[PDB]
């Protein structure tokens, strides 16, 4: 049936308006629509990544208590995804930073992660994602933060769940081998680490242009990462990727996914960026029924579902 272990979409919105903390639900940010998630599940997607802000979930100090109202909506979003059998990725979309400062204390980060994991420890369809897109920060620190997250998660008794770890350089697949080699050393008593890498297809890899470099750029940019995963005995996932609704990008997307389908010994699947209810005319919107990617990219993703 399905080609990959996991194939689905980011469900963005709870991390919107990040300049406004705590911000106001329904004004600065919004949670995903369970009904449009239901539509994507019906099409065959089985994984939904849910960005949220660390500061909204655990304000002021990451070692403190959660904010009950924001936590309630995270739980509602997650448990609805998982009630249907799909996996829900809990993603503190924080770039290795808390109140815009590098998270320099692995012990504080471990406590944050025990707190979060304790809210989901009996749900085997939750996936914990240590942090979205570490960047511009010490490389040993990135390793140590990922390890601290794992340690906190497992200390909470959340042992059935996969943990998505992310590297430096915005966890890019194309820069993985030269930047993130030290990530090979991460340890997990559950043996459920997945190396989450992101790959955009525009000139600079920022995912801000709908134009892709070429019809083969996706395969090109993930090839070395694929060899690093295999040689190091690791498993990976593409946790964010996108291209514009045009021929070159559509061919790049197909070529990337086809290459990944030939390498499922290491690639567990792929997650599109992004669906969510506040994208409007976003160049990559996967939100049913009118997102441009839902209209023009989903027909090329269904062959893998």
Ligand X SMILES: O=[N+]([O-])c1ccc(O[C@@H]2O[C@H](CO)[C@@H](O)[C@H](O)[C@H]2O)c(Cl)c1
**Site membership for ligand X, residue 92 (CB under 6 A):** no
198 is a contact residue toward ligand X (CB under 6 A): yes
Q: How far is the CB of 199 from ligand X (least distance, A)?
A: 8
- Exactly one of 66, 152, 205, 269 binds ligand X (CB under 6 A); that residue is 205
Write out the binding residues for ligand X, residues 22-61 only, by CB under 6 A.
none
Size of the site for ligand X (CB under 6 A): 11
Q: Which of residues 116-135 bind ligand X (CB under 6 A)?
A: 133
CA distances from 183 to 137, 277, 300 (A): 14, 34, 33
Structure tokens at 189: 């008593």
Closest CB to ligand X among residues 98, 200: 200
Three-state secondary structure of 206-261: CCCCCCCCCCCHHHHHHHHHHHHHHHCCCCEEEEEEECCCCHHHHHHHHHHHHHHH
Nearer to ligand X, 3 or 102 (CB): 102
Are residues 108 and 60 in contact, defined by beta-carbon separation less than 8 angstroms?
A: no
Q: Which is nearer to ligand X, 71 or 256 (CB)?
A: 256
Q: Any idea which residues carry the catalytic annotation?
A: 133, 240
Q: Are 245 and 293 in contact (CB under 8 A)?
A: yes
d(CA 73, CA 30): 9
How many Å separate Cα 52 from the centre of its chain? 11
243 scored as a contact of ligand X (CB under 6 A): no
Nearer to ligand X, 202 or 287 (CB): 202
Interface residues with ligand X (CB under 6 A) are 133, 169-170, 172, 175, 198, 200, 204-207
């Amino acid at each position: 049936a399905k080609v990959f272990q996991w194939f689905g979409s980011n469900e963005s919105g709870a991390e919107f308006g990040s300049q406004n903390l705590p911000g106001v639900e329904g004004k600065d940010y919004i949670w995903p629509d369970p009904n449009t998630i239901d539509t994507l599940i019906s099409k065959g997607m089985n994984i939904f990544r849910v960005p949220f802000m660390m500061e909204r979930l655990v304000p002021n100090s990451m070692t403190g208590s959660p904010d009950p109202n924001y936590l309630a909506d995270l739980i509602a979003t997650v448990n609805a995804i998982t009630q249907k059998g799909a996996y829900a990725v809990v993603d503190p979309h924080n770039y290795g930073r808390y109140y815009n400062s590098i998270i320099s204390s692995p012990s504080d980060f471990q406590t944050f992660w025990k707190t979060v994991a304790s809210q989901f420890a009996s749900n085997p369809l939750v996936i914990f994602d240590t942090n979205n897109e570490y960047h511009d920060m010490d490389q040993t620190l990135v390793l140590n933060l990922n390890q601290a997250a794992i340690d906190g998660i497992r200390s909470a008794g959340a042992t059935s769940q996969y943990i998505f770890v992310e590297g430096n350089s915005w966890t890019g697949a194309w820069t993985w081998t030269n930047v993130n080699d030290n990530m090979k050393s991460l340890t997990d008593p559950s043996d459920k680490i997945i190396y989450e890498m992101h790959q955009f297809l525009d000139s600079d890899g920022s995912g801000t242009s709908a134009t892709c470099v070429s019809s083969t750029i996706g395969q090109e940019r993930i090839t070395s990462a694929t060899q690093w995963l295999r040689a190091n005995g690791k498993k990976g996932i593409i946790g964010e990727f996108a291209g514009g609704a045009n021929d070159v990008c559509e061919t790049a997307i197909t070529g990337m996914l086809d290459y990944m389908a030939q390498n499922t010994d290491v690639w567990t699947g792929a997650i599109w960026w992004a669906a969510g209810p506040w994208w409007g005319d976003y160049i990559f919107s996967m939100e049913p029924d009118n997102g441009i990617a839902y209209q023009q990219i989903l027909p090329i993703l269904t062959p893998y579902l």
